[PDB]
Amino acid sequence: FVEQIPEAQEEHERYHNNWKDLKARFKLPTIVAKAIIEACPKCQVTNAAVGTWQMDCTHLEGQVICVAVHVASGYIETKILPRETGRETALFLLQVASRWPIEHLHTDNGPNFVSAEMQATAWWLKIEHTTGVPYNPQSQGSVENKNKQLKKTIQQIRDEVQYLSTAVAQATFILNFKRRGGLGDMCPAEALINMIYTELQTTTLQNQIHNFSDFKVYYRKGANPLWQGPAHLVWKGEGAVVLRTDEGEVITVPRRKAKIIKPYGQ
């Protein structure tokens, strides 16, 4: 695996990953990955619901950085607020809610997190806006750790980037996609996508059942040439179809004797 030693190093020149990501991507042993991490001068060594997010604000170089952090996975989003006001925070919440499903927001008791704009925006999306100390200190600790890691990444990256916004965006990209996490050895974005997909299993099943409750099927039973039906469709197979007649019977019909129609009416 020595042939992967140079290229991986080049990657660490652009994206300041950690040893876990390099080991998982280039199939390198832990010791050499830790050595590569240490070789860089600018480098050292919860069970909430799916729709729980937290918000925070930080001051850096006379600029306001608003950070929205997913609690379960650690996916983060950052924005540069022009001025600290309720309108800007409400707009940022609306922008975040237009990309991911938000069902419960946690935040401190700051002056700009209680304005009428914040309440109106939270009411428009039909979400529960909670202000105060979170019930689980683990979420607060994780949010603080995420903010500190973001600040460290800005410090690492700013030397190569002229403008603050570009550095913040690059740090967000590195945090979301480059550095891996804990259980499962997955990036925060991958974990968030997996959790959202897992949560969206019952709704698709219900939608499929509702849609299948619409198709009609005409079937021929036995040697009788006369068609029969209409009947409700239960399943359609490659060889035969399974139907449920209005009387409750379950009938298997070969594909050559069944015709499926979805009427334009109703």
Partner RNA sequence: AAAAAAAAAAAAAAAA
Partner RNA sequence: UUUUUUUUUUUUUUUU
Residues that bind Zn ion (CB under 5 A): 16, 40, 42-43
CA 95 – CA 8 distance, rounded (Å): 36
- Among residues 94, 84, 98, the alpha carbon closest in space to that of 119 is found at 94
Residue 135 vs 184, nearer CB to a second copy: 184
User: Per rule CB under 8 A, is residue 135 in the interface with a second copy?
Assistant: no
User: Per rule CB under 8 A, is residue 5 in the interface with a second copy?
Assistant: no
Q: Which residues contact 134 (CB under 8 A, 6 or more apart)?
A: 54, 106, 140
- Pinpoint the alpha helices (H) of 15-163: 19-26, 30-39, 86-97, 116-124, 137-157
- Looking at 43-51, 64-72, 147-155, 162-170, which segment touches a second copy (CB under 8 A)? 162-170
Instruction: Out of 81, 114, 193, 240, point to the residue binding a second copy (CB under 8 A).
Output: 193
SS3 106: strand
- The site that binds RNA (CB under 7 A) totals a number of residues, namely 12
Instruction: Out of 1, 197, 221, 235, point to the residue binding RNA (CB under 7 A).
Output: 221
Pick from RNA, a second copy, Zn ion, none: which does 222 bind, CB < 5 to 8 A by kind?
RNA
- Looking at 107-115, 126-134, 193-201, 217-225, which segment touches RNA (CB under 7 A)? 217-225
Pick from Zn ion, RNA, a second copy, none: which does 40 bind, CB < 5 to 8 A by kind?
Zn ion
What tokens does 16 get? 């300041």
Instruction: Out of 223, 249, 263, 265, point to the residue binding RNA (CB under 7 A).
Output: 223
CB 33 within 8 A of CB 22: yes
User: Per rule CB under 8 A, is residue 63 in the interface with a second copy?
Assistant: no
Dump the DSSP string for 196-208.
HHHHTHHHHHHHH
What tokens does 252 get? 């298997």
Instruction: Out of 41, 239, 248, 263, point to the residue binding RNA (CB under 7 A).
Output: 239
- The site that binds a second copy (CB under 8 A) totals a number of residues, namely 77
What tokens does 120 get? 């109106």
Asked whether the CA dihedral 9, 15, 18, 24 is positive or negative, the reply is negative
Residue 27 vs 99, nearer CB to RNA: 27
Dump the DSSP string for 241-256.
EEEE-TTS-EEEEEGG
What tokens does 255 get? 């594909």
User: Per rule CB under 7 A, is residue 182 in the interface with RNA?
Assistant: no
What tokens does 129 get? 């806006």
Pick from a second copy, RNA, Zn ion, none: which does 254 bind, CB < 5 to 8 A by kind?
RNA
Residue 156 vs 252, nearer CB to RNA: 252
For binding to RNA (CB under 7 A), which residues are involved?
Answer: 221-223, 238-240, 252, 254-257, 260
